[PDB]
């Protein structure tokens, strides 16, 4: 019976306003979903209109976006690394909207290798026999070697970003609203924005 | 007060019953109601108990395990009449329909057949 | 209160229905439909007050449940159906074929039409938009929507559609000089040519309407309904031709025809 209306606030002057009707149905109860990382639990709550909203009790994967090279893949959620609204929601590992997440790199490593044919995540080599020696060589024809050697302008990544492709996990940001639509979508941190939060994680 | 499956406590408790549990047919839709139901563990404080055979053994109790009641309403949907008579395919469902005989005294002795569905 | 209302009291009904006060407590309550209900007129009081083919609320029902009352070329069987403006009713057995037009005193006027002019109606559009896959839509005065219209039809333009086909026959563009009819406010029912449309950024646009006898007036843009190209109307007019007479001018023409 937790409500959301305005007649229980003290008014602008600082006077008590007395209740002039009962609490109504269209200030419906507001419990928190508290979506956390695990298997997939989705529960459905009807609303006014007979419509549905999918509140997310427990989530595994996401559909995060890359943007700078325009890639979107499903990817599972490793960890929550920073939250702006509350420093206590990260010690309980709860998915909210503007929290900075940590996801893997194996959808983004293999797409970037299957599109540019550069090794990625490598620092040492001498282990690259089974599916890495073949994908960059592939026995191309003439004009297929043509269209990939001209991508030596747009294969670069800024040094702050491939520093976290080497050691495995990329941190991204949720842009969806879990517990409202039931999904954890969003975009990957990059650029001057990534210098921001990687200060705000390091300063913790 | 009737018993209810799944109490696992002998005695009498009070349950909030919705549509579709047991022991409570509602009066209008969406109504929930608190009613006293008896536990599933049996005691000596029962006036009657229901009791159903799952295996017949030695001999015939007279009037209990003999005198077969004819199941007078046969299959009506055109998939439980095809399963009953083991019809393979397109075996003219309209032909093998079961028909009820009618034996009033003051009227002519009738027969009735159902509709078909699906 | 706890939901939508489905009663209507007799004195709260629109007075251009010209209802009684002492024949009952309640009013007909026109159903949800194409026209808004203060503007509109239901089918019940049309055949027992305006045409007197029936006497009760039962008798209007058992003409209508014999399935010959044709609103806009469709048989509508409920007797509280909201009729509205510029629609053709059609008895189709004794063949009167009325069109519902405001007279010059603000009321829906009984007005016959020839059975070949009954084939169409006119509608002011209220919104044009592109729909899915990049195709055009428009929505009209009534609830009829049209796909693929002639793309010259701007907002608040007047189209002519035929019933039994349903695609737009003629459009007639809202321009100064044309012959409009006002369907809302204190001046409604008068028919005159458009003088100018004076804009307001964000507020309500008002137009000035010159009639055919010098009495210019003004109502805002949401009440204006163009039915003529320059000076000739495409539909048949009622008597008075949308010329409001003054009360001395109503006095003498009425008390000399009763000579």
């Amino acid at each position: 019976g937790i409500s959301r209306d305005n007649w229980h606030k003290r008014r602008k002057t600082g006077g008590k306003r007395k209740p002039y009707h009962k609490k109504r149905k269209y200030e419906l109860g507001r419990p928190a979903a508290n979506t956390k990382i695990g298997p997939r639990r989705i529960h459905t709550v009807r609303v006014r209109g007979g419509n549905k909203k999918y509140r997310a009790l427990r989530l595994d994967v996401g559909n995060f976006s890359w943007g700078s090279e325009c890639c979107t893949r499903k990817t599972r959620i490793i960890d929550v690394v920073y939250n702006a609204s509350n420093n206590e929601l990260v010690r309980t590992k709860t998915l909210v909207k503007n929290c900075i997440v940590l996801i893997d790199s194996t959808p983004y490593r293999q797409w970037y290798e299957s599109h540019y044919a550069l090794p990625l995540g490598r620092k040492k080599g001498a282990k690259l026999t089974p599916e890495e020696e073949e994908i960059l060589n592939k026995k191309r024809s003439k004009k297929i070697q043509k269209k990939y050697d001209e991508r030596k302008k747009n294969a670069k990544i800024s040094s702050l970003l491939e520093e976290q492709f080497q050691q495995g996990k990329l941190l991204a940001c949720i842009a969806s609203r879990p517990g409202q639509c039931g999904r954890a979508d969003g975009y990957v941190l990059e650029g001057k924005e990534l210098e921001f939060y990687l200060r705000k994680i390091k300063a913790r | 007060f009737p018993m209810k499956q799944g109490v696992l406590t002998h005695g009498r408790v009070r349950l909030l019953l919705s549509k579709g549990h047991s022991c409570y047919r509602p009066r209008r839709t969406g109504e929930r109601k608190r009613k006293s139901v008896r536990g599933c563990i049996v005691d000596a404080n029962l006036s009657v108990l229901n009791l159903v055979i799952v295996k017949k053994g030695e001999k015939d109790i007279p009037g209990l395990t003999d005198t077969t009641v004819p199941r007078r309403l046969g299959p009506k949907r055109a998939s439980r009449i095809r399963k009953l008579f083991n019809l393979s395919k397109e075996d003219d469902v309209r032909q093998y329909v079961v028909r009820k005989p009618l034996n009033k005294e003051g009227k002519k002795p009738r027969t009735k057949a159902p509709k078909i569905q699906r | 209160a706890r939901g939508p209302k489905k009663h209507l009291k007799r004195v709260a009904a629109p007075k251009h229905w010209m209802l009684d006060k002492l024949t009952g407590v309640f009013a007909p309550r026109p159903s949800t439909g194409p026209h808004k209900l203060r503007e509109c007129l239901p089918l019940i009081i049309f055949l027992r007050n305006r045409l007197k083919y029936a006497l009760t609320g039962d008798e209007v029902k058992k003409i209508c449940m014999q399935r010959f009352i044709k609103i806009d070329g469709k048989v509508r069987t409920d007797i509280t159906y909201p009729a509205g403006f510029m629609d053709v009713i059609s008895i189709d057995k004794t063949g009167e074929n009325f069109r519902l037009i405001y007279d010059t005193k603000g009321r829906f006027a009984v007005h016959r039409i020839t059975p070949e002019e009954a084939k169409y109606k006119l509608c002011k559009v209220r919104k044009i938009f592109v729909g899915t896959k990049g195709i055009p839509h428009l929505v009209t005065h009534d609830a009829r929507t049209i796909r693929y219209p002639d793309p010259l039809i701007k907002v608040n333009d007047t189209i002519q559609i035929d019933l039994e086909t349903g695609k737009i026959t003629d459009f007639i563009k809202f321009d100064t000089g044309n012959l409009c009819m006002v369907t809302g406010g204190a001046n409604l029912g008068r028919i005159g040519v458009i003088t100018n449309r004076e804009r307001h950024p964000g507020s309500f646009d008002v137009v000035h309407v010159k009639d055919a006898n010098g009495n210019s007036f003004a109502t805002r843009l949401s009440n204006i309904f163009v039915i003529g190209k320059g000076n000739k109307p495409w539909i048949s007019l009622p008597r008075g031709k949308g010329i409001r007479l003054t009360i001395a001018e109503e006095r003498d023409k009425r008390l000399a025809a009763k000579q």
């Binding site: 302008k153 650029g191 924005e193 | - | -």
Partner: protein, 153 residues
């Protein structure tokens, strides 16, 4: 003197910051595209709402707030309370019993967007209205015009 003084990354929701940085796009000469829009009814967009560097959800020029409704005017009477000022609009109320007026007022909190510099105590500010922005702040500042200034010793 930086902009990022919050605990979340403040930015505009529409413009995309990353534009193929590489040997083509060098980090030495670096601007970002500034989303602004223009409000109808003939109100100008000041230079600081275009060549500024700020960020505001509730600025009418660069946020997600859309003015439509009344337009009023008042006097800036207290200039505390970050990004929202309180203005007082005096008026006259008429008592027809005594055939005389009654000098009334009521003040109102309005959103001072940071595209205005010389907003000091006692100015004229015309104000339009929009969606609810806070518990009491329903309006948004459109156009300051100075008073009691232009030369001070």
């Amino acid at each position: 003197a930086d902009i990022q003084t919050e605990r979340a990354y403040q930015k505009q929701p529409t413009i995309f910051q990353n534009k193929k940085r590489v040997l083509l796009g060098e980090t030495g000469k670096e601007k970002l595209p500034r989303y602004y829009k223009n409000i109808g009814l003939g109100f100008k967009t000041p230079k600081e709402a275009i060549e500024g560097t700020y960020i505001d959800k509730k600025c009418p020029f660069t946020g997600n707030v859309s003015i439509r409704g009344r337009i009023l005017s008042g006097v800036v009477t207290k200039m505390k309370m970050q990004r929202t000022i309180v203005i007082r609009r005096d008026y006259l109320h008429y008592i027809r019993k005594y055939n005389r007026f009654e000098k009334r007022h009521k003040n109102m909190s309005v959103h001072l967007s940071p595209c205005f510099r010389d907003v000091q105590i006692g100015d004229i500010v015309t104000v339009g209205e929009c969606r609810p922005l806070s518990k009491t702040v329903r309006f948004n500042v459109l156009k300051v015009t100075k008073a009691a200034g232009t030369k001070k010793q």
